[PDB]
Design a protein around this nucleic acid. Structure first.
Ligand SMILES: [K+]
Length: 290
DNA sequence: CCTCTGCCTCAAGACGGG
DNA sequence: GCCCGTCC
DNA sequence: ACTTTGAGGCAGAG
């Protein structure tokens, strides 16, 4: 994500962070990064050193995680759309089996040209969902107006939901969106390096004073704060500001009734889940729809 | 103050019975 | 409520 | 990634 950004916001713009009750999200739609979440399931849902799996050794940890997490959100009246990345390893088989499961649950999903986080942001911008619920601060860096942070952790711990508001962030820092991108690069982004010596304090000052990365190097003393060689900040700046994304007007998001017999055939027949648990999950899914 | 860096420890996904 | 054992 | 791995606290040097 962005190295330090949540702590920085809590340190300098805490009013951009709202603590809200899970009950106030009832009826809201939220975009969720399927690629990221599959990966977390592959790491966490383990037994005796291995993922869960059927008799033939096919992994089911991603399905276990995605089935019950999705039911849990719907039971809270939060209607999710999952976004799959575009251009422990998450395979194509993981993706396709999670997509199959979600159709069978009646849960929508979209495929993203490139970065799921950015395309999640594009759904928020366009008003197609209320927020992105992801664990990546870079959603804010991609321009997303609202980001629900640690939704599942808060749900389990019966804790209030941290909700980051990009507009209040810019207002407290005195920064436009373009200038906020450059800050996040200085903090440390996935795309390129950060200047050694320049931490969260020094980064905010220079951005507020000078307003752009290229300006910074000119005013910076090269001897004291040398930038790394062939620094790709220009390209990273371009990846955040104008990312390849899907069209949020393009696909209608619809939430359908779950296809129980096909879910039994697939989760129980093939993947060898317990039939009682799958029916019990479906029943809660039906009740959630109301 | 400000950034490193190194040394430490401590859940982690979800459900449900006890 | 909180532990833990178990899920496949 | 639980027979491990990252964050997050904390303290000390440049
Ligand atoms: K740095």
């Amino acid at each position: 994500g962005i190295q330090g950004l949540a702590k920085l916001i809590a340190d300098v713009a805490p009013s951009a962070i709202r603590e809200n009750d899970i009950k106030s999200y009832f009826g809201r739609k939220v975009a969720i990064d399927a690629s990221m979440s599959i990966y977390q399931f592959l790491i966490a849902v383990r037994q005796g050193g291995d993922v869960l799996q059927n008799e033939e050794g096919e992994t089911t940890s991603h399905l276990m995680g995605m089935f019950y997490r999705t039911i849990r959100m719907m039971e809270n009246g939060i209607k999710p759309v999952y976004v799959f990345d575009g251009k422990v390893k998450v395979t194509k088989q993981h993706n396709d089996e999670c997509k199959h499961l979600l159709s069978l649950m009646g849960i929508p999903y979209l495929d993203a040209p490139s970065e799921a986080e950015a395309s999640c942001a594009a759904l928020v911008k366009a008003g197609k969902v209320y927020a992105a619920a992801t664990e990546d601060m870079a959603c804010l860096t991609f321009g997303s107006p609202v980001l629900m942070f640690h939704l599942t952790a808060s749900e389990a711990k019966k804790l209030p939901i941290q909700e980051f508001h990009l507009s209040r962030i810019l207002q407290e820092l005195g920064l436009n969106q373009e200038q906020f991108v450059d800050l996040c690069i200085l903090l440390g982004s996935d795309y390129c390096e950060s200047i050694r010596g320049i931490g969260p304090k020094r980064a905010v000052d220079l951005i507020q004073k000078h307003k752009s990365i290229e300006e910074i190097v000119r005013r910076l003393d090269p001897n004291k704060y040398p930038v790394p060689e062939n620094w790709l900040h220009k390209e990273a700046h371009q990846l955040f500001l104008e990312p390849e994304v899907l069209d949020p007007e393009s696909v209608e998001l619809k939430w359908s009734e779950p296809n129980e017999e096909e879910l039994i055939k697939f989760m129980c027949g093939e993947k060898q889940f317990s039939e009682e648990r799958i029916r019990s999950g479906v029943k809660r899914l039906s009740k959630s729809r109301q």
